[PDB]
Amino acid sequence: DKQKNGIKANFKIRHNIEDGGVQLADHYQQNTPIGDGPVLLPDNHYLSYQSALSKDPNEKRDHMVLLEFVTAAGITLGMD
Amino acid sequence: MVSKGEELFTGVVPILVELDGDVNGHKFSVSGEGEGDATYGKLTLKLICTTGKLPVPWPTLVTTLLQCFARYPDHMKQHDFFKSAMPEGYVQERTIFFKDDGNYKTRAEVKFEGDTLVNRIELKGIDFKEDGNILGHKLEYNYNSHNVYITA
Fold this sequence. Notes:
The complex is a heterodimer. Chain A is built from no helices and four strands.
């Protein structure tokens, strides 16, 4: 039921460990519309993510400034 | 052009994020605002832990804390589930398995509330090691790039 009229995604995050090494986080995802209406059901593809974490130098609370850049890809035009 | 929901993302959209979390009994809340620009595939958020000190590293929450703002260029517009579900929106659920540590489970509703795109989330984490990389805060404050593979 959690991907009904929807999608699923799978991916692996690489978190860098202080002083070397990588902590892996394996993600499994399901999306389903909140409404009951028609939606676009895509062919297989991927979202290319890039992210940058910063701090507001004027902010004293525990916080994160997050930038993400995200572009869909992996479906070609024409034949294959 | 392809869905009506797509129309909602042709300019800069304001965003609100609200998260309630509980990891190994360590409860916290995060609240955020900023904006998204699907034309460029870009979003920016400032996210504050409103309960004081975040008990997990900020990087571990990045994926939890808006794939409707992905740039879907050209023919990709025919495959853009996220925007077509708007403005009523969608539920996004995950399990996130940290290798050799605990896991997060999340449920978020991503929808328009007036002219603001809202991401309202709950998170529960269990089985974390008290001095593993998460609860022991041994992750660098940075992030790398990744591909999120979508299938229907």
